[PDB]
Amino acid sequence: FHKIRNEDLIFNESLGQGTFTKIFKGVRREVGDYGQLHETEVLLKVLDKAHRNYSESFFEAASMMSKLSHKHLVLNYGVCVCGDENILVQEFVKFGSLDTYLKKNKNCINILWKLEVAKQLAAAMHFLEENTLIHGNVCAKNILLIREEDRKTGNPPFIKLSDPGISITVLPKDILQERIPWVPPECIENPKNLNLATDKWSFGTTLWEICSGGDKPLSALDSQRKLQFYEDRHQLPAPKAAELANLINNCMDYEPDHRPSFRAIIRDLNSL
Ligand SMILES: NC(=O)Nc1sc(-c2ccccc2)cc1C(N)=O
């Protein structure tokens, strides 16, 4: 990672929290192309000092997103490790994360919007699958809306996939259980089972989010009941707008080897 000096970063408003992290809008002072000075809006992701022992996994998550370059993958600008800080500096996305956007805009998001976003997410995941690169935490909170839909210009929405955060392979078991049904059953059984098939299951859960207007699947179940949901081999209920429910369930296959390739997922989406 490129090293960014603390003196070149300004922290502004809080944008929320992730697992052992706090996120802020900020400004980065930098020399850009042609030697021009810029004050660039950035996303500042800060690892909690209490959890500094996760720094390796924290940065490895972002390293994963920068191994490859792709129009649907969030840009990392660098890191700031001055003083006692562990900070990831990323591109700032004006419209924020997709979970919040879905909850706030539930009434004006139709089937075609959901289908377009699903196709773009599947394109990003196909690129990762072709590169045999595991993401490990696909969810609407890790999808960023770059551009809103604009029917006046026919322009679709445009999304990017953000980094997965600290890996489920090192997180405490209680956090993994609270992350059911994004974390697949085989990873509840053994977090070292993390594999490309993991991301197919979590993609299914994320499509359910996209189709459910901000709702979180199984939110009414406490951790013990989420575990039993997997033990009883249940599937999620179909979203009220159920156009993608069969795809969701085919992706959330309890047999990892039976989950469809992202090429097949894309073909299915294109058939609708
Ligand atoms: N890369 C990036 O910008 N990530 C962003 S921006 C954002 C946001 C923006 C405006 C109002 C409220 C929240 C949230 C998050 C996130 N969860 O990552």
Curated annotation (Swiss-Prot):
Annotated ranges, domain Protein kinase: 9-272
Record keywords, A-Z: Adaptive immunity, ATP-binding, Chromatin regulator, Chromosomal rearrangement, Cytoplasm, Disease variant, Immunity, Innate immunity, Kinase, Magnesium, Membrane, Metal-binding, Nucleotide-binding, Nucleus, Phosphoprotein, Proto-oncogene, Repeat, SH2 domain, Transferase, Tyrosine-protein kinase, Ubl conjugation
UniProt domain comment: Possesses 2 protein kinase domains. The second one probably contains the catalytic domain, while the presence of slight differences suggest a different role for protein kinase 1.
Subunit structure: Interacts with EPOR, LYN, SIRPA, SH2B1 and TEC. Interacts with IL23R. Interacts with SKB1. Interacts with STAM2. Interacts with IFNGR2 (via intracellular domain). Interacts with LEPR (Isoform B). Interacts with HSP90AB1; promotes functional activation in a heat shock-dependent manner. Interacts with STRA6. Interacts with RHEX; this interaction occurs in a erythropoietin (EPO)-dependent manner. Interacts with ASB2; the interaction targets JAK2 for Notch-induced proteasomal degradation. Interacts with MPL/TPOR.
Broad class of the protein's primary localization: membrane
GO molecular function, one term: ATP binding
Modifications after synthesis and translation: Autophosphorylated, leading to regulate its activity. Also phosphorylated by TEC. Phosphorylated on tyrosine residues in response to interferon gamma signaling. Phosphorylated on tyrosine residues in response to a signaling cascade that is activated by increased cellular retinol. Undergoes Notch-induced ubiquitination and subsequent proteasomal degradation which is mediated by ASB1 or ASB2, the substrate-recognition components of probable ECS E3 ubiquitin-protein ligase complexes.
Gene for this chain: JAK2
GO biological process: actin filament polymerization; activation of Janus kinase activity; adaptive immune response; apoptotic process; axon regeneration; cell adhesion; cell differentiation; cell surface receptor signaling pathway via JAK-STAT
Tissues showing expression: Ubiquitously expressed throughout most tissues.
Residue range from the parent sequence: 537 to 808 of 1132
Name of protein: Tyrosine-protein kinase JAK2
Residues recorded with modification Phosphotyrosine: Y34
Signal peptide start and end residues: none
Cellular localisation: Endomembrane system; Cytoplasm; Nucleus
Consequence the record notes for mutating K3L: In myeloproliferative disorder with erythrocytosis; requires 2 nucleotide substitutions
Key word Magnesium present: yes
Family assignment from sequence similarity: Belongs to the protein kinase superfamily. Tyr protein kinase family. JAK subfamily.
Disease: Chromosomal aberrations involving JAK2 are found in both chronic and acute forms of eosinophilic, lymphoblastic and myeloid leukemia. Translocation t(8;9)(p22;p24) with PCM1 links the protein kinase domain of JAK2 to the major portion of PCM1. Translocation t(9;12)(p24;p13) with ETV6. Budd-Chiari syndrome: A syndrome caused by obstruction of hepatic venous outflow involving either the hepatic veins or the terminal segment of the inferior vena cava. Obstructions are generally caused by thrombosis and lead to hepatic congestion and ischemic necrosis. Clinical manifestations observed in the majority of patients include hepatomegaly, right upper quadrant pain and abdominal ascites.
GO cellular component, one term: glutamatergic synapse
